[PDB]
Ligand binder design. Structure first.
Ligand SMILES: Oc1ccccc1F
Ligand SMILES: Oc1ccccc1F
Lengths: 122, 122
């Protein structure tokens, strides 16, 4: 179960994997039965196959942290970042905060991505 | 129950109240039986009297948002901010993300403040 420093490293590497768009490496960060709520407020998606389908649909994309990872001492953390993408030939940016809980093996057990339309910029 | 735009306004006003240090106005934002986990990972504190005691102990302090509020459509949001304080005559800064759930009256029902020692700068 990752320490606070290890959560900082894992969550930063998640953003680097989203940024390059390595779907298979992203999926491997998740527990095999993880859930993703993205955006938070919508129903969870369950397990690596569903999660892979989500990232493949969603991911030229750039992602970068826009402030430090905030980690806890119970395997969780939160981070702010910006995703830039191209939508109907119109580039846009989305500001997001992800909250993650890691399991006892260092895998993401739950992902909650906070954002709404108010965080999109076209 | 606040809409996404209303969550953005409520969470920004919370930071303005922390920044000026108005304990009674901060406490009034919370539901009478709210909980606070600060830092997340520690046991919750319950109800306005406990919450007032927490802010009075904790709060010259400056607080400002360091990126936009990320709101949901189910009365929740998350925000990144920086708190500057004076510790043993040594000014320091703490980077934090608060995750809030508001109730059906617009009051904070749950507060979870993500940060650890790794987010403190002396
Ligand atoms: O975790 C995420 C959240 C929002 C958009 C892309 C992501 F990879
Ligand atoms: O919500 C908070 C979190 C951390 C420090 C001060 C705060 F007011």
């Amino acid at each position: 179960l990752p320490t606070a420093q290890e959560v900082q490293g894992l969550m930063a590497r998640y953003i680097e994997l989203v940024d390059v768009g390595d779907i298979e490496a992203i999926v491997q960060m998740y527990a095999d039965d993880a859930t993703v709520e993205n955006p938070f407020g919508q129903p969870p998606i369950h397990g690596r196959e569903q999660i892979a389908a989500f990232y493949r649909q969603g991911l030229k994309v750039r992602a970068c942290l826009t402030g430090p990872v905030r980690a806890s001492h119970n395997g969780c953390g939160a981070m702010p970042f910006r995703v830039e993408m191209v939508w109907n030939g119109q580039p846009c940016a989305l500001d997001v905060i992800d909250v993650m809980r890691f399991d006892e093996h260092g895998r993401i057990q739950t992902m909650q991505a906070y954002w709404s339309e108010v965080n999109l910029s076209v």
